[PDB]
Amino acid sequence: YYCYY
Amino acid sequence: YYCYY
Ligand SMILES: *[C@@H]1O[C@H](CO)[C@H](O)[C@H](O)[C@H]1O
Ligand SMILES: *[C@@H]1O[C@H](CO)[C@H](O)[C@H](O)[C@H]1O
């Protein structure tokens, strides 16, 4: 999965 | 923050 910060 | 699964 991937996350934006 | 938000994550794509
Ligand atoms: C997340 O955003 C970037 C641009 O910041 C890019 O379009 C990636 O493909 C996306 O997953
Ligand atoms: C994550 O992706 C969705 C896809 O429908 C949408 O562009 C949201 O604005 C983005 O944050």
Side-chain angles (χ1 to χ4, degrees):
Chain A
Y1 63 95
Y2 58 105
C3 309
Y4 285 90
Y5 300 96
Chain B
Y1 73 96
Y2 52 107
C3 302
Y4 287 87
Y5 289 104

mmCIF file of all heavy atoms in Angstrom:
data_model
loop_
_atom_site.group_PDB
_atom_site.id
_atom_site.type_symbol
_atom_site.label_atom_id
_atom_site.label_comp_id
_atom_site.label_asym_id
_atom_site.label_seq_id
_atom_site.Cartn_x
_atom_site.Cartn_y
_atom_site.Cartn_z
ATOM 1 N N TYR A 1 0.839 -1.207 0.000
ATOM 2 C CA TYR A 1 0.000 0.000 0.000
ATOM 3 C C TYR A 1 0.869 1.249 0.000
ATOM 4 O O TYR A 1 2.087 1.155 0.161
ATOM 5 C CB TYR A 1 -0.951 -0.009 1.200
ATOM 6 C CG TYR A 1 -0.316 0.014 2.570
ATOM 7 C CD1 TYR A 1 -0.140 1.209 3.249
ATOM 8 C CD2 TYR A 1 0.064 -1.160 3.205
ATOM 9 C CE1 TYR A 1 0.398 1.243 4.501
ATOM 10 C CE2 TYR A 1 0.614 -1.133 4.462
ATOM 11 C CZ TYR A 1 0.783 0.069 5.108
ATOM 12 O OH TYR A 1 1.326 0.108 6.374
ATOM 13 N N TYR A 2 0.285 2.424 -0.219
ATOM 14 C CA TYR A 2 1.086 3.647 -0.199
ATOM 15 C C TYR A 2 0.301 4.784 0.442
ATOM 16 O O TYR A 2 -0.930 4.823 0.400
ATOM 17 C CB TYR A 2 1.576 4.049 -1.606
ATOM 18 C CG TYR A 2 0.506 4.281 -2.646
ATOM 19 C CD1 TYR A 2 0.161 5.567 -3.042
ATOM 20 C CD2 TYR A 2 -0.130 3.212 -3.267
ATOM 21 C CE1 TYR A 2 -0.817 5.791 -4.022
ATOM 22 C CE2 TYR A 2 -1.117 3.427 -4.236
ATOM 23 C CZ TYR A 2 -1.444 4.710 -4.613
ATOM 24 O OH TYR A 2 -2.414 4.909 -5.583
ATOM 25 N N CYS A 3 1.036 5.713 1.044
ATOM 26 C CA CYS A 3 0.435 6.796 1.813
ATOM 27 C C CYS A 3 1.048 8.128 1.412
ATOM 28 O O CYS A 3 2.260 8.227 1.184
ATOM 29 C CB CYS A 3 0.633 6.636 3.323
ATOM 30 S SG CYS A 3 0.184 5.040 4.008
ATOM 31 N N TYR A 4 0.201 9.150 1.371
ATOM 32 C CA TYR A 4 0.604 10.530 1.146
ATOM 33 C C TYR A 4 0.747 11.253 2.470
ATOM 34 O O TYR A 4 -0.116 11.139 3.349
ATOM 35 C CB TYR A 4 -0.418 11.281 0.299
ATOM 36 C CG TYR A 4 -0.391 10.920 -1.160
ATOM 37 C CD1 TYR A 4 -1.184 9.890 -1.654
ATOM 38 C CD2 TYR A 4 0.429 11.606 -2.045
ATOM 39 C CE1 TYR A 4 -1.171 9.567 -2.991
ATOM 40 C CE2 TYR A 4 0.449 11.284 -3.380
ATOM 41 C CZ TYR A 4 -0.352 10.263 -3.846
ATOM 42 O OH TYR A 4 -0.567 10.011 -5.177
ATOM 43 N N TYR A 5 1.808 12.048 2.579
ATOM 44 C CA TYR A 5 2.068 12.854 3.766
ATOM 45 C C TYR A 5 2.255 14.302 3.360
ATOM 46 O O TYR A 5 2.830 14.575 2.307
ATOM 47 C CB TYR A 5 3.314 12.359 4.492
ATOM 48 C CG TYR A 5 3.236 10.926 4.950
ATOM 49 C CD1 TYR A 5 3.782 9.904 4.184
ATOM 50 C CD2 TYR A 5 2.625 10.594 6.151
ATOM 51 C CE1 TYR A 5 3.722 8.584 4.606
ATOM 52 C CE2 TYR A 5 2.558 9.274 6.585
ATOM 53 C CZ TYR A 5 3.108 8.274 5.803
ATOM 54 O OH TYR A 5 3.052 6.964 6.228
ATOM 55 N N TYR B 1 -2.961 12.318 7.060
ATOM 56 C CA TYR B 1 -2.398 11.590 5.926
ATOM 57 C C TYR B 1 -3.349 10.504 5.469
ATOM 58 O O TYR B 1 -4.266 10.131 6.180
ATOM 59 C CB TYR B 1 -1.036 11.006 6.285
ATOM 60 C CG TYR B 1 -1.007 9.814 7.228
ATOM 61 C CD1 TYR B 1 -0.931 8.521 6.734
ATOM 62 C CD2 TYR B 1 -0.969 9.987 8.608
ATOM 63 C CE1 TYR B 1 -0.858 7.430 7.578
ATOM 64 C CE2 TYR B 1 -0.901 8.896 9.466
ATOM 65 C CZ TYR B 1 -0.847 7.622 8.942
ATOM 66 O OH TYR B 1 -0.780 6.538 9.780
ATOM 67 N N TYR B 2 -3.162 9.991 4.260
ATOM 68 C CA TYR B 2 -4.111 9.012 3.760
ATOM 69 C C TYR B 2 -3.374 7.968 2.945
ATOM 70 O O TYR B 2 -2.309 8.230 2.376
ATOM 71 C CB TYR B 2 -5.237 9.667 2.940
ATOM 72 C CG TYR B 2 -4.770 10.593 1.841
ATOM 73 C CD1 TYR B 2 -4.869 10.220 0.511
ATOM 74 C CD2 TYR B 2 -4.258 11.851 2.139
ATOM 75 C CE1 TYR B 2 -4.447 11.073 -0.503
ATOM 76 C CE2 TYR B 2 -3.830 12.702 1.140
ATOM 77 C CZ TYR B 2 -3.932 12.309 -0.176
ATOM 78 O OH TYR B 2 -3.507 13.163 -1.169
ATOM 79 N N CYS B 3 -3.943 6.775 2.911
ATOM 80 C CA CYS B 3 -3.268 5.628 2.332
ATOM 81 C C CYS B 3 -4.199 4.949 1.353
ATOM 82 O O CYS B 3 -5.385 4.773 1.630
ATOM 83 C CB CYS B 3 -2.841 4.608 3.389
ATOM 84 S SG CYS B 3 -1.757 5.222 4.686
ATOM 85 N N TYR B 4 -3.649 4.548 0.223
ATOM 86 C CA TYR B 4 -4.370 3.763 -0.765
ATOM 87 C C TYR B 4 -4.073 2.295 -0.541
ATOM 88 O O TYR B 4 -2.906 1.893 -0.533
ATOM 89 C CB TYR B 4 -3.965 4.148 -2.184
ATOM 90 C CG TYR B 4 -4.484 5.466 -2.673
ATOM 91 C CD1 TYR B 4 -3.795 6.639 -2.419
ATOM 92 C CD2 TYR B 4 -5.663 5.542 -3.411
ATOM 93 C CE1 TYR B 4 -4.256 7.858 -2.882
ATOM 94 C CE2 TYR B 4 -6.137 6.771 -3.875
ATOM 95 C CZ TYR B 4 -5.422 7.918 -3.606
ATOM 96 O OH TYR B 4 -5.849 9.154 -4.058
ATOM 97 N N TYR B 5 -5.127 1.503 -0.401
ATOM 98 C CA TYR B 5 -5.003 0.067 -0.213
ATOM 99 C C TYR B 5 -5.437 -0.726 -1.430
ATOM 100 O O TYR B 5 -5.198 -1.940 -1.462
ATOM 101 C CB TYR B 5 -5.821 -0.374 0.989
ATOM 102 C CG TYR B 5 -5.228 0.066 2.284
ATOM 103 C CD1 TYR B 5 -5.764 1.137 2.988
ATOM 104 C CD2 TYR B 5 -4.121 -0.578 2.812
ATOM 105 C CE1 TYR B 5 -5.217 1.539 4.190
ATOM 106 C CE2 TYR B 5 -3.566 -0.180 4.015
ATOM 107 C CZ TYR B 5 -4.115 0.878 4.698
ATOM 108 O OH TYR B 5 -3.568 1.274 5.893
HETATM 109 C C1 LIG C 1 0.548 10.022 -6.030
HETATM 110 O O1 LIG C 1 0.751 11.319 -6.533
HETATM 111 C C2 LIG C 1 1.869 11.388 -7.435
HETATM 112 C C3 LIG C 1 2.046 12.857 -7.766
HETATM 113 O O2 LIG C 1 2.431 13.602 -6.611
HETATM 114 C C4 LIG C 1 1.678 10.487 -8.658
HETATM 115 O O3 LIG C 1 0.573 10.931 -9.423
HETATM 116 C C5 LIG C 1 1.433 9.049 -8.180
HETATM 117 O O4 LIG C 1 1.098 8.210 -9.309
HETATM 118 C C6 LIG C 1 0.293 9.050 -7.185
HETATM 119 O O5 LIG C 1 0.154 7.737 -6.693
HETATM 120 C C1 LIG C 2 -7.193 9.365 -4.245
HETATM 121 O O1 LIG C 2 -7.672 8.818 -5.434
HETATM 122 C C2 LIG C 2 -9.066 9.098 -5.643
HETATM 123 C C3 LIG C 2 -9.485 8.259 -6.843
HETATM 124 O O2 LIG C 2 -10.842 8.506 -7.176
HETATM 125 C C4 LIG C 2 -9.302 10.601 -5.782
HETATM 126 O O3 LIG C 2 -8.622 11.096 -6.928
HETATM 127 C C5 LIG C 2 -8.780 11.303 -4.532
HETATM 128 O O4 LIG C 2 -8.894 12.706 -4.750
HETATM 129 C C6 LIG C 2 -7.324 10.898 -4.299
HETATM 130 O O5 LIG C 2 -6.894 11.514 -3.102
#
